[PDB]
Amino acid sequence: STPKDIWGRYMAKFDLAKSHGSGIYVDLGGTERVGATQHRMPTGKCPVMGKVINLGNNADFLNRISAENPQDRGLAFPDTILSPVSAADLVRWGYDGNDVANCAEYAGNIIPASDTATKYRYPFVYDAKEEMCHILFTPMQYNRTSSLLCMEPMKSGIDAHLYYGSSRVDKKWEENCPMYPVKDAIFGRGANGSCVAIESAFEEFTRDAEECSALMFENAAADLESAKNSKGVGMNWANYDSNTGLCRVIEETPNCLIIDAGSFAMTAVGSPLEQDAVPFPCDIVTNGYIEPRPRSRHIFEVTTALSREALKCSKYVHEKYSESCGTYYYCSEEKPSSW
Numbered sequence: 081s082t083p084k085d086i087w088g089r090y091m092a093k094f095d096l097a098k099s100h101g102s103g104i105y106v107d108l109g110g111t112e113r114v115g116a117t118q119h120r121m122p123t124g125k126c127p128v129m130g131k132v133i134n135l136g137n138n139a140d141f142l143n144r145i146s147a148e149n150p151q152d153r154g155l156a157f158p159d160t161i162l163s164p165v166s167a168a169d170l171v172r173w174g175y176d177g178n179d180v181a182n183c184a185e186y187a188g189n190i191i192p193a194s195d196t197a198t199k200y201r202y203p204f205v206y207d208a209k210e211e212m213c214h215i216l217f218t219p220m221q222y223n224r225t226s227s228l229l230c231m232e233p234m235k236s237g238i239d240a241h242l243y244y245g246s247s248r249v250d251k252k253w254e255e256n257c258p259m260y261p262v263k264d265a266i267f268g269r270g271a272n273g274s275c276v277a278i279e280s281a282f283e284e285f286t287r288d289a290e291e292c293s294a295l296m297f298e299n300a301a302a303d304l305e306s307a308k309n310s311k312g313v314g315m316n317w318a319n320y321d322s323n324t325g326l327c328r329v330i331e332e333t334p335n336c337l338i339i340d341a342g343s344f345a346m347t348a349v350g351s352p353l354e355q356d357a358v359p360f361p362c363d364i365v366t367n368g369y370i371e372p373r374p375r376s377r378h379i380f381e382v383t384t385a386l387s388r389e390a391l392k393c394s395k396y397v398h399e400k401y402s403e404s405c406g407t408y409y410y411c412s413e414e415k416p417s418s419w
């Protein structure tokens with residue numbers, strides 16, 4: 081069938097407006113009355129790996145907001161115990177999903193004292209390394225050593241094992257959300273029976289996938305500077321070429337992939353680490369253009385494919401190794417050195 085068609089099942093997760101549906105960088109996509117007041121809160125459906133909040137006082141954001149020393153205060157629930165709780169605790173208490181899902185459901189069952197009927201819920205951060213579930217005392221994420229109240233989100237490689245989310249996290253987050261870089265992949269959209277690489281919103285050389293991930297994250301869907309809501313729209317995806325270090329951040333929704341060894345197709349919600357990648361899906365076969373075609377006022381367009389029959393080529397066919405699928409084919413102007 082068409083590229084859009086044969087990719088449709090695999091690529092649904094990458095449509096972050098649908099699978100997540102709220103801001104990623106800053107998620108304040110919901111509002112709820114608590115008494116007389118409206119308050120904004122996160123409502124995104126995917127957990128966001130590696131999202132930490134950097135604080136003005138330089139305290140780790142998972143410290144209690146009620147630490148004795150003001151220099152120590154984070155964003156975590158005070159001890160006056162709701163929080164943090166262990167993954168095992170949550171299973172003790174009857175929760176039946178994975179740990180990240182349990183943590184989200186647990187955040188969903190903690191109701192603000194000031195009003196016992198509010199639909200208002202706090203965010204969580206699940207630490208997969210310590211297996212501990214933290215409830216945050218505030219949905220604040222971005223605000224201009226200062227105070228704790230001076231803050232911004234960042235995507236952190238070494239905290240890749242942290243998951244920031246809202247109580248609306250999909251129980252099936254792991255299958256429905258793009259949580260992993262796709263190895264040997266470039267994001268594209270279907271055009272004229274091929275998968276064509278999506279043009280960069282902007283590009284920069286970065287030192288590793290994590291840096292590329294952090295660059296894109298800063299520009300991802302953000303529910304502030306009601307009408308301040310992103311609906312999940314933003315520069316949410318990036319192609320990291322591990323051979324060149326070129327990070328291409330994109331803002332169009334991908335709906336297919338092009339195979340290309342050494343390239344990593346990353347998203348603002350998913351792991352920042354190459355280590356966490358998932359192999360290219362060898363079973364889904366289409367012809368791809370590796371290079372974009374942006375608007376330009378000024379040669380040969382390399383195509384790739386997992387099979388010789390699928391590859392559209394008007395010159396020489398070569399073979400290249402990929403970790404994901406072993407050998408695949410590309411169309412080049414050079415004659416094979418086998419010849």
Ligand SMILES: [Ca+2]
Pocket residue numbers: 174175176
């Ligand atoms: Ca149960």
